[PDB]
């Protein structure tokens, strides 16, 4: 009766974001994103990726519900290093990451083939 | 220079009551010139130690070796000042309590400080003149190091 | 009446023993699943050579406000008492917490169960009654993680 | 039925002179059914 | 009893201007004596009501906890000598009562 529907895990409807930035209060220096109809695949990639930076604090996330899809990001940097742009520096390298990877497996795929 | 207590001390027993936990043993240790017996519990796997083992112990208020406080937090980007690096092995807890040899109108001969680091203890057994520099309810730094 | 039971229990015996470290990010992801947390990483108990947090200060982090505990451990030996060691427990029996901050020791049933003198009785007796309620689901999820 | 009690509940407790409480072994008696007035008023019995 | 014979151990306990209060003004001394044959009988009372030595009773205030709450509040150093006059004490336990 309530099963929901299983489109629903990933896609968004008309009425909400897929980001939201909050700026924390306890601490100076702190975001709190909110990435929407995500789960730990995405979660963990950009908690491990964070943590390798050399100049930020804090780094983890969490699913509030397993069954709400549902994921929030807490960073904290040093005081000249505004959260948001270490997100995206994290998420170029990331990117960079990824494609390096897809053509370096290409070559070896074309290296096994004869 | 904030050092709170500066001594050398040797290894007698790994553990004498058994190997109660598996990355944590119980070392027994007495000095060589100021005769204080020290009983102190020390990640194994992290940092091995075996009998016979010659270092030298020192409990600071700071790292920093400078007298400023460090009010307690964890900052990896303040290596500026240079704080206390040299020593091998690094370990930050609390005094909790103080026992001694105190009576009723004698003051105290021996004072005995224990120390919690997070659950990793300490007893210092010791003259009063080397421990007085030990306030209760205190934060206190660990340093280890080996020697030749 | 309320009472920390069932894989919480027992995930907080192993997670309080004196032998469980945590690495970095081990301690943001357990730190992340808290509520009450004030957003400051306390110092960990290990510099160096790496850091590591132990169990019993994540858990100190948990306590709400200064309680003032103690406790012995199911498998507190009788000797303990009477003779040396007595506040060094090196089967790492009685529980003491200081300033809200936890010292020694396990807990079990007898700490944060459905026992009089508990943990959670002295935290409902002091603090009030939200910061008990924050208390127990802070327990939970951090220990579930 | 007699036997020496272990528990500290059925055992003698007195004020010593020295005003600590010592535990004393006293024979008691635990009877099946109840004559109660009877066994008051017998010789020899505690009415306390 | 506190014992003030000694008065070493007193003066450690306590500070000067405590302790030549103390060891003077009879007045004192009279009332700290009076608290302990209060305290005497009131200890005979407890063993009339209480056989089998059952020291375990159910009370509203954890006093034990309150004063080692006290104590970790206002970081109180139980090595050097307090500064609390023991009729400071006998008053407002009595007005509190």
Same mark, same amino acid.
């Given at each position: 009766?309530?099963?929901?529907?299983?489109?629903?895990?990933?896609?968004?409807?008309?009425?909400?974001?897929?980001?939201?930035?909050?700026?924390?209060?306890? /601490?100076?220096?702190?975001?709190?994103?909110?990435?929407?109809?995500?789960?730990?695949?995405?979660?963990?990639?950009?908690?491990?990726?964070?943590?390798?930076?050399?100049?930020?604090?804090?780094?983890?996330?969490?699913?509030?519900?397993?069954?709400?899809?549902?994921?929030?990001?807490? /960073?904290?940097?040093?005081?000249?290093?505004?959260?948001?742009?270490?997100?995206?520096?994290?998420?170029?390298?990331?990117? $960079?990451?990824? $494609?390096?990877?897809?053509?370096?497996?290409?070559?070896?795929?074309?290296?096994?083939?004869? | 220079?904030?050092?709170?207590?500066?001594?050398?001390?040797?290894? &007698?027993?790994?553990?004498?009551? #058994?190997?109660?936990?598996?990355?944590?043993?119980?070392?027994?240790?007495?000095?060589?010139?100021?005769?204080?017996?020290?009983?102190?519990?020390?990640?194994?796997?992290?940092?091995?130690?075996?009998?016979?083992?010659?270092?030298?112990?020192?409990?600071?208020?700071?790292?920093?070796?400078? #007298?400023?406080?460090?009010?307690?937090?964890?900052?990896?980007?303040?290596?500026?000042?240079?704080?206390?690096?040299?020593?091998?092995?690094?370990?930050?807890? &609390?005094?909790?309590?103080?026992?001694?040899?105190?009576?009723?109108?004698?003051?105290?001969?021996?004072?005995?400080?224990?120390?919690?680091?997070? #659950?990793?203890?300490?007893?210092?057994?010791?003259?009063?003149?080397?421990?007085?520099?030990?306030?209760?309810?205190?934060?206190?730094?660990?340093?280890?190091?080996?020697?030749? | 009446?309320?009472?920390?039971?069932?894989?919480?229990? %027992?995930?907080? =015996?192993?997670?309080?023993? =004196?032998?469980?470290?945590?690495?970095?990010?081990?301690?943001?992801?357990?730190?992340?699943?808290?509520?009450?947390?004030?957003?400051?990483?306390?110092?960990?108990?290990?510099?160096? @050579? =790496?850091?590591?947090? %132990?169990?019993?200060?994540?858990?100190?982090?948990?306590? @709400?406000?200064?309680?003032?505990?103690? =406790?012995?451990?199911?498998?507190? @030996?009788?000797?303990?008492?009477?003779?040396?060691?007595?506040?060094?427990? @090196?089967?790492?029996?009685?529980?003491?917490?200081?300033?809200?901050?936890?010292?020694?020791?396990?807990?079990?049933?007898?700490?944060?169960? %459905?026992?009089?003198?508990?943990?959670?009785?002295?935290?409902?007796?002091?603090?009030?009654?939200?910061?008990?309620?924050?208390?127990?689901?802070?327990?939970?999820?951090?220990?579930?993680? | 039925?007699?036997?020496?009690? *272990?528990?500290?509940?059925?055992?003698?407790?007195?004020?010593?002179?020295?005003?600590?409480?010592?535990?004393? *072994?006293?024979?008691?008696?635990?009877?099946?059914?109840?004559?109660?007035?009877?066994?008051?008023?017998?010789?020899?019995?505690?009415?306390? | 009893?506190?014992?003030?014979?000694?008065?070493?151990?007193?003066?450690?306990?306590?500070?000067?201007?405590?302790?030549?209060?103390?060891?003077?003004?009879?007045?004192?001394?009279?009332?700290?004596?009076?608290?302990?044959?209060?305290?005497?009988?009131?200890?005979?009372?407890?063993?009339?009501?209480?056989?089998?030595?059952?020291?375990?009773?159910?009370?509203?205030?954890?006093?034990?906890?309150?004063?080692?709450?006290?104590?970790?509040?206002?970081?109180?150093?139980?090595?050097?000598?307090?500064?609390?006059?023991?009729?400071?004490?006998?008053?407002?336990?009595?007005?509190?009562?």
């Amino acid at each position: 009766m309530n099963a929901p529907p299983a489109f629903e895990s990933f896609l968004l409807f008309e009425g909400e974001k897929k980001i939201t930035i909050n700026k924390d209060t306890k /601490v100076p220096n702190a975001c709190l994103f909110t990435i929407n109809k995500e789960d730990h695949t995405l979660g963990n990639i950009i908690k491990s990726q964070l943590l390798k930076d050399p100049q930020v604090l804090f780094a983890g996330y969490k699913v509030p519900h397993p069954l709400e899809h549902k994921i929030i990001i807490r /960073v904290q940097t040093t005081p000249d290093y505004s959260p948001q742009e270490a997100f995206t520096n994290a998420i170029t390298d990331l990117i $960079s990451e990824l $494609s390096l990877l897809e053509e370096r497996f290409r070559v070896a795929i074309k290296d096994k083939q004869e | 220079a904030g050092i709170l207590f500066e001594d050398i001390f040797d290894v &007698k027993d790994i553990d004498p009551e #058994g190997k109660k936990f598996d990355r944590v043993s119980r070392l027994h240790c007495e000095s060589e010139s100021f005769k204080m017996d020290l009983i102190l519990d020390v990640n194994i796997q992290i940092y091995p130690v075996d009998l016979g083992d010659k270092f030298r112990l020192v409990i600071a208020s700071t790292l920093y070796e400078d #007298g400023t406080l460090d009010d307690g937090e964890y900052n990896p980007t303040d290596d500026r000042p240079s704080r206390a690096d040299q020593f091998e092995y690094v370990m930050y807890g &609390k005094v909790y309590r103080i026992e001694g040899d105190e009576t009723s109108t004698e003051a105290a001969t021996r004072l005995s400080a224990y120390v919690s680091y997070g #659950g990793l203890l300490m007893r210092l057994q010791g003259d009063a003149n080397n421990l007085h520099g030990f306030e209760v309810d205190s934060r206190v730094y660990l340093l280890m190091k080996k020697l030749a | 009446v309320m009472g920390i039971v069932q894989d919480t229990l %027992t995930a907080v =015996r192993k997670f309080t023993k =004196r032998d469980v470290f945590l690495e970095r990010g081990e301690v943001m992801n357990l730190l992340m699943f808290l509520s009450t947390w004030d957003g400051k990483v306390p110092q960990p108990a290990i510099l160096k @050579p =790496r850091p590591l947090w %132990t169990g019993k200060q994540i858990f100190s982090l948990i306590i @709400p406000g200064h309680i003032n505990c103690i =406790r012995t451990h199911s498998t507190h @030996p009788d000797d303990e008492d009477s003779g040396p060691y007595k506040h060094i427990s @090196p089967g790492d029996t009685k529980v003491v917490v200081e300033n809200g901050e936890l010292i020694m020791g396990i807990l079990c049933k007898k700490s944060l169960g %459905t026992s009089a003198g508990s943990l959670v009785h002295i935290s409902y007796l002091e603090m009030g009654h939200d910061i008990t309620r924050l208390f127990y689901s802070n327990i939970q999820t951090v220990i579930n993680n | 039925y007699m036997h020496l009690p *272990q528990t500290d509940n059925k055992k003698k407790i007195i004020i010593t002179e020295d005003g600590e409480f010592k535990a004393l *072994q006293e024979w008691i008696l635990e009877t099946d059914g109840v004559s109660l007035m009877r066994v008051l008023s017998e010789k020899d019995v505690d009415p306390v | 009893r506190f014992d003030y014979t000694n008065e070493r151990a007193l003066r450690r306990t306590l500070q000067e201007d405590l302790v030549k209060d103390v060891l003077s003004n009879a007045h004192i001394q009279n009332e700290l004596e009076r608290e302990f044959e209060r305290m005497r009988e009131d200890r005979e009372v407890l063993r009339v009501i209480f056989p089998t030595g059952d020291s375990k009773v159910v009370l509203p205030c954890n006093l034990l906890r309150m004063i080692w709450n006290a104590q970790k509040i206002f970081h109180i150093n139980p090595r050097l000598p307090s500064d609390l006059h023991p009729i400071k004490v006998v008053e407002g336990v009595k007005e509190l009562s």
